[PDB]
């Protein structure tokens, strides 16, 4: 890293001079807790049929969504103290912070 | 092998399976498509699988400028020394700039309205076309860049393009920081959590790790609860703009054509200012436009964004609810009665236990958004901890944070303190009446609105040389 | 690698009879960074990436 | 991991049921601080001649040893309150805890 | 070819030689060094990390092994008695020796060529490195077989697997007890011990039990304790002929000395009745490891202190002040501040002459430089790192000996009677041993007692129906 | 892969007429886990790895 600079790099490289990839693009997330996979190191809970998590069946994400998340949309409650721009700035901000790639096609 | 079309579970596909009695998908041999996030160390049987952040963690407007050098150069106007970002060359919005068009191999924007043939836009981040409301914010920031560079060139005639671009970029980055930490985050967290997780800034600390935590990528999806089922467009009297003032969201995903051909960004920005967000309630978590019909116009089947969030947490090996409660210093319910107490809702607790068996297993998003919200905030204590912790690191660990000694002069900091999102709209659109501060709370026309000329502009005099 | 629509305008600038030399040198450097070393290579790339460059062929 | 067991596995697998590799053999060390490499991600300080660390020349390990560690060995100070078994148990215990592989010739 | 080349090319990181080196007059030579294996080889995305080949737990994996094939190879599979395999060609006055390993390049054979005694086979690959180490490995192997023998007598119907597992579990518990009751208090001293290892409560499944990268370097504090000779004493604790004080550069990998020069008894006596070297700020480490490490078995003598510092760099460890900060200790910036922290201005000057800033001091060098805590043998930095590590190994170990359900109350009461002096009495020809605490007792005859005064481990509560 | 010197004693046990079935079967299983499926495969491995098998 140069010893003096004035502007951010594009990739975020060199923001942290002692550990210069910190906050830079195309690097692994930090973990705040150890990861929990069905096989210890790679396979997600839900991968292998019959394999439980911590003593209990894994619930289909779609099932959880159906039974807990779904509601009739005519019941919707407007927030009296927040604009839709509150929602929108959130998404726009999210897209300054993180994008997690996945493989194409 | 093609995750988009097959229901076979083979890497890299982890398709969501279908329960019996699904309200939409009758056929249990079908599935909701899902690609596992790319591993940092592909193929390893030693490493613990982790995923990748393709962006700068910093709040640096990388969604405008990009996070990689080729793209950052491609976004720039290289035909003069004016330091500008490139603008669309085929279309403008009542004489104001639009985002340039991208050139994708399988362009999903083209599949929304085929006759119009309007491709996806090119921006700092690849998702800029996902909903036109997002596109409008992107477009607004592009224009603000060009405005600042234009003014700086006038003020400092000897500056070359690189200098102009860097100086404007720095100002835009600062404005996203200010809007985020002054206006937005207090209304997410509420005042107690805001004081706890974001105490008054001191100075840059080079020992604060600024990376995005894996769990944040899922927890910050709390925002899905805020989404309305329509996009709303209003005219210069803040009346419904005909003849599609209320478009179902499943007809706006990747619908870039709507920005270009159906009235530009002004109607959309007004609609965001003068329409309420959806409230997250425990029996009304997320709407069917994203739970039943996400991206239905550009893919074989409508997706379920809540279900995807839960599949993704599993793909990323995230611990369940109680592990995160514990991490955050919060009590961990073991029984259905305790879960009832924590959620102030025995009925929801019963439903969660029917699904998950134990609160240890509840997926982080589902658990997070189930919690009652903090006073004057829109998350509960678990999400507030995760989100507040993340944003503290982003601030304290950012060598270029706008308040850090040596980044801006005292006079420049004084000028930037006057910026606001309503003013940025006034400066770069045809809108002359805007939300009063706080824009994120102000939601009702005309009571919460003011003329643009009452809002003070950013004074750049302290940028002179 | 993919040629972008707005870069078509840069071809025009490179072909503008009395546009400034320094401007064209700027753009030549820009396209050299992308592996396009001639206005031949530039318009060829635009074509393969789906665009109309027939307007340039007078 | 089986939900009931009675003995340790040899590899340490399944000691932690929620994250069953933790403390198991042939896994990455945990980091208590971000790493500090000359290039951010792989090269050790001292690799490239002329490249400083945080503003200063890197000292030859052997020079630090010569100038700080060396002493006239026959002036050694016996420890009145420790046996050499105190040294030895330490090494033995170390060899319960960590072995860091290196490539073979 | 890092063993013979001085070219710096992956994976070699040879130590270069300074001008006027006191020992290596050839500046074009080097000290060989292979970089630790990366967890994700070849990656330009991941931050390079290293690999622990062993179980982190205090589980006597150095006896039993950390891999299934090796663990089975260590066992006697010719009967159902649950025993560890023993050397089949040599005994030590009728008692077991470790079996011999079969290495492709065996360094032990190079130490005494005519004797042709190869390295030993044990749970860990380094068991032959010094005969003192070998003796402790041999002692624990014997204790395994003794426990299995007694358990078979007590429970005749137990099969070999049961016997082996039950003895293994007892040995694991004894290592834990000697470590936490007897050893670590004399490392850390009372203040640090109370701070970093408060009284045990119960297993906590959210305590991460992994070894931290930095611990692999900080726990090398022990190199400062090393005496330049191996001392051997007879049954009157007198110097045992013909070589009672062997320079350490003539005992590395010298397995022949255990087999052919008097077995483990003289070595264990020497350990009990000789003092450790004291770490002092002007007397850090001896010539036999700084100048002659492994000189009998390779082309050049290594420098163990220098290797420690190269390895910290190889592992990307932060410098002294970063670790001070992590531990909540003040970080000196100036020579005068460093003088205050080390209570030694002269050493502070030497360190600043080398490193320029205390931010750059390598963690081992900085750790061992600090003044020692009262009644311990490390300063506050190393006390923090080591104490934190061992707290996690205890609280995060589901099979910790005091965890409810691992042993019965009666068994725990019996285990509390064990000690390393008793283990020596039970498995060797020694009849006079150190009084507790063995790690402090060091002078014969003042600090010694007859074996008959020590109570034996009572296994009566292991009896099954 | 490397044959270990103490495993030579197991060959003796396998060739002892008076060692019992269960004892031999445990050892055979142990050597089958290492790719050695007969006393011939076992002795041959010991030989290749540098041991004296002349007694056989
Ligand atoms: C610059 O920023 C640094 C990082 O600060 C963190 O992030 C910022 C954004 C804020 O949120 C901060 O509040 C936050 O701490 C600061 O350095 C940190 O200072 C603290 C205080 O000295 C250090 O904590 C101490 O850590 C010692 C080592 O043990 C830690 O690591 C273990 C391994 O992971 C873990 O098991 C331990 O639990 C412990 O983890 C820390 O716990 C504390 C308590 O919640 C947190 O505050 C830390 O962030 C944790 N860190 C993580 C992520 O691991 C402990 O030994 C020590 O505790 C012991 O001693 C004190 C002595 O008084 C007792 O109070 C206590 O009971 C116990 O006996 C203490 O927790 C932390 O490690 C430092 N982090 C780094 C990266 O260096 C700087 O101080 C700040 N500088 C300035 C000028 O602002
Ligand atoms: C079982 O062990 C768990 C782990 O315990 C650690 O290791 C053992 C060996 C002991 O040394 C123990 O003291 C260690 O903590 C333990 O769970 C832990 O509990 C603490 C306290 O509740 C949690 O700390 C809180 O952390 C949150 C989140 O931020 C943390 O992580 C980020 C990112 O790495 C860091 O940047 C932060 O600095 C934190 O380290 C904090 O928000 C929170 O602080 C806030 O709240 C407190 C209290 O109001 C205020 O004092 C602060 O100023 C803040 O306002 C705490 O620091 C810790 O995350 C958690 N760890 C795990 C792995 O879950 C658990 O309680 C034990 N249970 C028992 C013994 O029954
Ligand atoms: C119109 C508004 C929004 C969407 C449309 C939308 C959609 C998605 C999708 C499809 C994902 C990926 C799902 C998966 O796991 O495969 C997704 C992820 C993320 N979101 Fe969503 N979102 C809209 C709106 C919001 C709002 C308001 C957010 C926050 C306030 C928000 C956040 C996020 C985040 C952080 C992610 C993860 C990003 C990553 O890749 O790291 N979104 N959203
Ligand atoms: C006779 C006593 C000791 C040695 C001989 C000896 C030698 C080494 C060597 C060669 C290494 C590796 C050097 C490198 O980085 O290439 C080494 C590392 C470690 N030690 Fe040493 N050691 C002897 C004695 C002790 C004592 C008394 C220790 C602690 C009380 C101690 C610790 C360690 C540790 C933990 C390591 C790192 C092991 C790993 O690979 O993770 N040693 N030692
Ligand atoms: C798809 O795009 C076309 C092209 O803009 C839209 O057609 C226009 O529709 C409006 C109102 O119907 C008219 O003002 C235009 O004259 C139409 N233009 C053309 C070129 O036909 C069409 O409405 C869009 N589809 C939908 C469902 O909205
Ligand atoms: C190397 O090993 C040989 C063989 O053990 C040692 O020779 C023995 O030495 C002792 C004492 O000197 C005698 O009592 C034996 O009779 C010797 N045996 C043989 C085979 O000659 C020799 O001392 C060792 N060399 C070293 C390194 O000291
Ligand atoms: C570059 O700037 C000029 C002058 O503002 C403008 O006319 C032109 O369209 C811009 N080009 C691009 C591709 O943005
Ligand atoms: C196994 O135990 C028997 C009985 O003690 C003994 O004679 C034999 O040598 C042992 N074998 C090994 C390989 O240790
Ligand atoms: Ca960013
Ligand atoms: Ca172990």
Structure report:
- Helix content of chain A is 22%, strand content 8%.
- Chain A is α+β, with helices and mostly antiparallel strands and 105 residues long.
- Chain A has one domain (1-104).
- The radius of gyration of chain A is 21 Å and the shape is flat.
- With 465 residues, chain B is mostly helical.
- Chain B has one domain (1-465): Haem peroxidase domain superfamily, animal type (Myeloperoxidase, subunit C), CATH 1.10.640.
- Chain B has helices at 62-65, 69-74, 132-155, 161-189, 191-197, 214-219, 256-261, 266-274, 288-291, 305-315, 321-327, 336-343, 346-356, 364-370, 381-396, 410-416, 421-428; strands at 52-53, 230-232, 246-248, 276-278, 433-435, 449-451.
- In chain B, helix 3 (132-155) packs across helix 4 (161-189), helix 3 (132-155) packs across helix 8 (266-274) and helix 12 packs across helix 13 (346-356).
- Chain C is mainly alpha-helical.
- Chain C has one domain (1-57).
- Helices cover 52% and strands 0% of the residues of chain C.
- The longest helix of chain C has 12 residues, at 21-32.
- The chains are: A alpha+beta (105), B mainly alpha (465), C mainly alpha (58).
- At the D-E interface, strand 1, helix 1, strand 2 and helix 2 of D face strand 1, helix 1, helix 3, helix 4 and helix 5 of E.
- A molecule of 2 linked components (NAG-NAG) binds at residues 113, 115-116, 257, 261 of chain B.
- It is classed as oxidoreductase.
- Keywords: enzyme substrate complex, inhibitor.
């Amino acid at each position: 890293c140069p010893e003096q600079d004035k502007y951010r790099t594009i990739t975020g490289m060199c923001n942290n001079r002692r550990s210069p990839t910190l906050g830079a693009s195309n690097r692994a997330f930090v973990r705040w807790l150890p990861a929990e996979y069905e096989d210890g190191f790679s396979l997600p809970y839900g991968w292998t049929p019959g394999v439980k998590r911590n003593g209990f069946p894994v619930a289909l994400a779609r099932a959880v969504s159906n039974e807990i998340v779904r509601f009739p949309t005519d019941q919707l409650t407007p927030d009296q103290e927040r604009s839709l721009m509150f929602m929108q700035w959130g998404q726009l901000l999210d897209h300054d912070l993180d994008f997690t790639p996945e493989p194409a096609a | 092998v093609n995750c988009e079309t097959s229901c076979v579970q083979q890497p890299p596909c982890f398709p969501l399976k279908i329960p019996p009695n699904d309200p939409r998908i009758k056929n249990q041999a079908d599935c909701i498509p899902f690609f596992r996030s790319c591993p940092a160390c592909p193929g390893s049987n030693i490493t613990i699988r982790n995923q990748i952040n393709a962006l700068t963690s910093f709040v640096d407007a990388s969604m405008v400028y990009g996070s990689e050098e080729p793209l950052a150069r491609n976004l720039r106007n290289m035909s003069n020394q004016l330091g500008l970002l490139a603008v669309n060359q085929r279309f403008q919005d009542n004489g104001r700039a639009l985002l340039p068009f991208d050139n994708l191999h399988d362009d999903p924007c083209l599949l929304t309205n085929r006759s119009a043939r309007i491709p996806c836009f090119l921006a700092g981040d690849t998702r800029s076309s996902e909903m036109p409301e997002l596109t409008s914010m992107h477009t607004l920031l592009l224009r603000e860049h060009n405005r600042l560079a234009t003014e700086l060139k006038s003020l400092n005639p000897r500056w070359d393009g690189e200098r102009l671009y860097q100086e404007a970029r720095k100002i835009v980055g600062a404005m996203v920081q200010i809007i985020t930490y002054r206006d937005y985050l207090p209304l997410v967290l509420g005042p107690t959590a805001m004081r706890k997780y974001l105490p008054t800034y001191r100075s840059y600390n080079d020992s604060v790790d600024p990376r995005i935590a894996n769990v944040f990528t899922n927890a910050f999806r709390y925002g899905h609860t805020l989404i309305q089922p329509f996009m709303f467009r209003l005219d210069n009297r803040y009346q419904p703009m005909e003849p599609n003032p209320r478009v179902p969201l499943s007809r706006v995903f990747f619908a870039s054509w709507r920005v270009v051909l159906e009235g530009g960004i002004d109607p959309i920005l007004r609609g965001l200012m003068a329409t309420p967000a959806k409230l997250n309630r425990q029996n009304q978590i997320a709407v069917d436009e994203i739970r039943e019909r996400l991206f239905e116009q550009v893919m074989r089947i409508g997706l379920d964004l809540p279900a995807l969030n839960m599949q993704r947490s599993r793909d990323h090996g995230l611990p369940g609810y109680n592990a995160w409660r514990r991490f955050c210093g919060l009590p961990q319910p073991e029984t259905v009665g305790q879960l009832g107490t924590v959620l102030r809702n025995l009925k929801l607790a019963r439903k969660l236990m029917e699904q998950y068996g134990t609160p240890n297993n509840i997926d982080i998003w589902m658990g997070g958004v189930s919690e009652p919200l903090k006073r004057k905030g829109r998350v509960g204590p678990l999400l507030a901890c995760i989100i507040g912790t993340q944003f503290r690191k982003l601030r304290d660990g950012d060598r270029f944070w706008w308040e850090n000694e040596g980044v801006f002069s005292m006079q420049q900091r004084q000028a930037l303190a006057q910026i606001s999102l309503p003013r940025i709209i006034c400066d770069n659109t045809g809108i002359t009446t805007v939300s009063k501060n706080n824009i994120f709370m102000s939601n009702s026309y005309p009571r919460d609105f003011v003329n643009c000329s009452t809002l003070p502009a950013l004074n750049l005099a302290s940028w002179r040389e | 690698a993919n040629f972008l629509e707005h870069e078509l305008s840069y071809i025009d600038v490179l072909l503008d009879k009395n546009a400034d030399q320094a401007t064209k040198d700027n753009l030549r450097s820009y396209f050299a960074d992308k592996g396009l070393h001639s206005i031949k290579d530039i318009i060829n790339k635009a074509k393969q990436d789906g665009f109309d460059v027939s307007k340039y062929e007078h």
